[PDB]
Every structure is written in structure tokens, then in C-alpha cells.
Design a protein around this motif. Structure first.
Motif, PDB file in Angstrom:
ATOM      1  N   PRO A 168     -15.305  42.761 -28.251  1.00 39.20           N
ATOM      2  CA  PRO A 168     -15.493  42.163 -29.577  1.00 39.20           C
ATOM      3  C   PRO A 168     -14.835  40.775 -29.593  1.00 39.20           C
ATOM      4  CG  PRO A 168     -13.808  43.822 -29.729  1.00 39.20           C
ATOM      5  CD  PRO A 168     -14.362  43.881 -28.294  1.00 39.20           C
ATOM      6  N   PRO A 169     -15.280  39.891 -30.533  1.00 36.98           N
ATOM      7  CA  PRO A 169     -14.753  38.535 -30.597  1.00 36.98           C
ATOM      8  C   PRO A 169     -13.289  38.562 -31.052  1.00 36.98           C
ATOM      9  CG  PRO A 169     -16.914  38.708 -31.688  1.00 36.98           C
ATOM     10  CD  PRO A 169     -16.369  40.116 -31.504  1.00 36.98           C
ATOM     11  N   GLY A 170     -12.535  37.566 -30.599  1.00 33.85           N
ATOM     12  CA  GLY A 170     -11.116  37.526 -30.992  1.00 33.85           C
ATOM     13  C   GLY A 170     -10.883  37.147 -32.468  1.00 33.85           C
ATOM     14  N   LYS A 171      -9.629  37.201 -32.901  1.00 31.04           N
ATOM     15  CA  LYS A 171      -9.283  36.921 -34.306  1.00 31.04           C
ATOM     16  C   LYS A 171      -9.457  35.442 -34.590  1.00 31.04           C
ATOM     17  CE  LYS A 171      -4.276  36.444 -33.774  1.00 31.04           C
ATOM     18  NZ  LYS A 171      -3.064  36.899 -34.488  1.00 31.04           N
ATOM     19  N   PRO A 172      -9.616  35.088 -35.886  1.00 29.85           N
ATOM     20  CA  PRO A 172      -9.677  33.679 -36.228  1.00 29.85           C
ATOM     21  C   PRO A 172      -8.388  32.933 -35.812  1.00 29.85           C
ATOM     22  CG  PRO A 172      -9.453  35.005 -38.186  1.00 29.85           C
ATOM     23  CD  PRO A 172      -9.762  35.950 -37.051  1.00 29.85           C
ATOM     24  N   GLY A 173      -8.602  31.686 -35.497  1.00 34.91           N
ATOM     25  CA  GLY A 173      -7.533  30.742 -35.123  1.00 34.91           C
ATOM     26  C   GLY A 173      -6.621  30.383 -36.309  1.00 34.91           C
ATOM     27  N   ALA A 174      -5.475  29.856 -35.950  1.00 28.34           N
ATOM     28  CA  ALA A 174      -4.440  29.436 -36.927  1.00 28.34           C
ATOM     29  C   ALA A 174      -4.933  28.275 -37.782  1.00 28.34           C
ATOM     30  CB  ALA A 174      -3.229  29.003 -36.147  1.00 28.34           C
ATOM     31  N   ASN A 175      -4.489  28.268 -39.028  1.00 26.05           N
ATOM     32  CA  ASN A 175      -4.763  27.128 -39.933  1.00 26.05           C
ATOM     33  C   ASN A 175      -4.189  25.830 -39.382  1.00 26.05           C
ATOM     34  OD1 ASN A 175      -6.019  28.770 -41.868  1.00 26.05           O
ATOM     35  ND2 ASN A 175      -4.220  28.985 -43.128  1.00 26.05           N
ATOM     36  N   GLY A 176      -5.007  24.796 -39.462  1.00 20.58           N
ATOM     37  CA  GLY A 176      -4.524  23.446 -39.199  1.00 20.58           C
ATOM     38  C   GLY A 176      -3.503  23.001 -40.214  1.00 20.58           C
ATOM     39  N   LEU A 177      -2.649  22.069 -39.774  1.00 20.33           N
ATOM     40  CA  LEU A 177      -1.597  21.544 -40.637  1.00 20.33           C
ATOM     41  C   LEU A 177      -2.164  20.496 -41.595  1.00 20.33           C
ATOM     42  CD1 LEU A 177       1.255  21.279 -38.031  1.00 20.33           C
ATOM     43  CD2 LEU A 177       0.719  23.096 -39.687  1.00 20.33           C
ATOM     44  N   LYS A 220     -15.477  36.935 -26.566  1.00 23.19           N
ATOM     45  CA  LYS A 220     -15.313  35.485 -26.683  1.00 23.19           C
ATOM     46  C   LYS A 220     -14.142  35.170 -27.612  1.00 23.19           C
ATOM     47  CE  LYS A 220     -19.323  35.726 -28.658  1.00 23.19           C
ATOM     48  NZ  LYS A 220     -20.657  35.364 -29.192  1.00 23.19           N
ATOM     49  N   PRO A 221     -13.689  33.911 -27.628  1.00 21.37           N
ATOM     50  CA  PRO A 221     -12.641  33.531 -28.584  1.00 21.37           C
ATOM     51  C   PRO A 221     -13.092  33.701 -30.029  1.00 21.37           C
ATOM     52  CG  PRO A 221     -12.795  31.921 -26.810  1.00 21.37           C
ATOM     53  CD  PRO A 221     -13.985  32.837 -26.656  1.00 21.37           C
ATOM     54  N   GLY A 222     -12.121  33.886 -30.897  1.00 22.66           N
ATOM     55  CA  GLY A 222     -12.361  33.918 -32.353  1.00 22.66           C
ATOM     56  C   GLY A 222     -12.774  32.567 -32.921  1.00 22.66           C
ATOM     57  N   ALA A 223     -13.092  32.610 -34.181  1.00 20.70           N
ATOM     58  CA  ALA A 223     -13.508  31.383 -34.909  1.00 20.70           C
ATOM     59  C   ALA A 223     -12.407  30.314 -34.833  1.00 20.70           C
ATOM     60  CB  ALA A 223     -13.842  31.715 -36.346  1.00 20.70           C
ATOM     61  N   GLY A 235     -11.574  39.449 -27.375  1.00 18.37           N
ATOM     62  CA  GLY A 235     -11.307  38.091 -26.952  1.00 18.37           C
ATOM     63  C   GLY A 235      -9.983  37.516 -27.493  1.00 18.37           C
ATOM     64  N   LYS A 236      -9.616  36.367 -26.995  1.00 17.95           N
ATOM     65  CA  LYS A 236      -8.415  35.622 -27.458  1.00 17.95           C
ATOM     66  C   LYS A 236      -8.627  35.103 -28.868  1.00 17.95           C
ATOM     67  CE  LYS A 236      -7.705  31.305 -26.307  1.00 17.95           C
ATOM     68  NZ  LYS A 236      -8.232  30.567 -27.484  1.00 17.95           N
ATOM     69  N   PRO A 237      -7.517  34.717 -29.545  1.00 19.44           N
ATOM     70  CA  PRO A 237      -7.634  34.083 -30.856  1.00 19.44           C
ATOM     71  C   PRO A 237      -8.470  32.798 -30.761  1.00 19.44           C
ATOM     72  CG  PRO A 237      -5.402  34.709 -30.440  1.00 19.44           C
ATOM     73  CD  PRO A 237      -6.139  34.879 -29.124  1.00 19.44           C
ATOM     74  N   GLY A 238      -9.054  32.404 -31.880  1.00 17.08           N
ATOM     75  CA  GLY A 238      -9.687  31.115 -31.957  1.00 17.08           C
ATOM     76  C   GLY A 238      -8.765  29.954 -31.691  1.00 17.08           C
ATOM     77  N   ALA A 239      -9.379  28.852 -31.365  1.00 18.71           N
ATOM     78  CA  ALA A 239      -8.706  27.544 -31.242  1.00 18.71           C
ATOM     79  C   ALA A 239      -7.943  27.220 -32.515  1.00 18.71           C
ATOM     80  CB  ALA A 239      -9.676  26.482 -30.872  1.00 18.71           C
ATOM     81  N   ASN A 240      -6.843  26.534 -32.322  1.00 19.23           N
ATOM     82  CA  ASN A 240      -6.036  26.086 -33.458  1.00 19.23           C
ATOM     83  C   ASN A 240      -6.887  25.153 -34.340  1.00 19.23           C
ATOM     84  OD1 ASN A 240      -3.575  27.363 -33.056  1.00 19.23           O
ATOM     85  ND2 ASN A 240      -2.875  25.789 -31.653  1.00 19.23           N
ATOM     86  N   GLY A 241      -6.636  25.261 -35.644  1.00 20.30           N
ATOM     87  CA  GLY A 241      -7.186  24.280 -36.587  1.00 20.30           C
ATOM     88  C   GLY A 241      -6.714  22.882 -36.319  1.00 20.30           C
ATOM     89  N   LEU A 242      -7.543  21.912 -36.693  1.00 17.82           N
ATOM     90  CA  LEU A 242      -7.212  20.486 -36.528  1.00 17.82           C
ATOM     91  C   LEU A 242      -6.512  20.005 -37.791  1.00 17.82           C
ATOM     92  CD1 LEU A 242     -10.575  19.378 -34.849  1.00 17.82           C
ATOM     93  CD2 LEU A 242      -8.439  20.038 -33.736  1.00 17.82           C
TER      94      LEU A 242
END
Lengths: 30, 30, 30
Positions: B7-16, A10-13, C9-16
């Protein structure tokens, strides 16, 4: 021979929220 | 048999960050 | 035989993005 791969993970956090911006400039003269 | 999910993907990018706040109100009267 | 895990999995969703900063101080006296 090896068995087939499972599906993708699944996607990451979700990323962190951005933090709050800085305070605004002083207002104009009264 | 087929393997398990990956396995789950990496954490997402920090928001701006938010942007600078509005100007303050006008100062007190003259 | 037991198959391997699937792909990561893919990276997480972008931060808001964050909230705008607060209003600035009151302006100077008139």
C-alpha cells in the motif's frame, strides 16, 4: 508455504506547501 | 506467486510557513 | 499460493516552504 512478498508500496502524497508568511512591519518615516 | 506492491505510504510532513514580509515603504513627505 | 502485498511505502516527500508575507504598510508622515 506463502508466496514471496510483493515489492514495497510507493511513497505517500507530497506534504502540503507551507502557507504564506505574515505582513511586514510599517515603513520608516517619510 | 509473488504478491502485489504494498500500500502507498503516509502523507508527507507539512511545509513550513513563509516568513514575515519586508518593511513597508517610507511614509509621505514632511 | 498468492503472496502477500509488499511492505507499505515510505512517507511522502516533505512539503515545500511557503512564500514570504507581503510588504508592510507605508510608514508615518515625515
Amino acid at each position: 508455504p506463502p508466496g514471496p512478498p510483493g515489492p514495497p508500496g510507493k511513497p505517500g502524497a507530497n506534504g502540503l506547501s507551507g502557507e504564506r508568511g505574515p505582513p511586514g512591519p510599517p515603513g520608516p518615516p517619510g
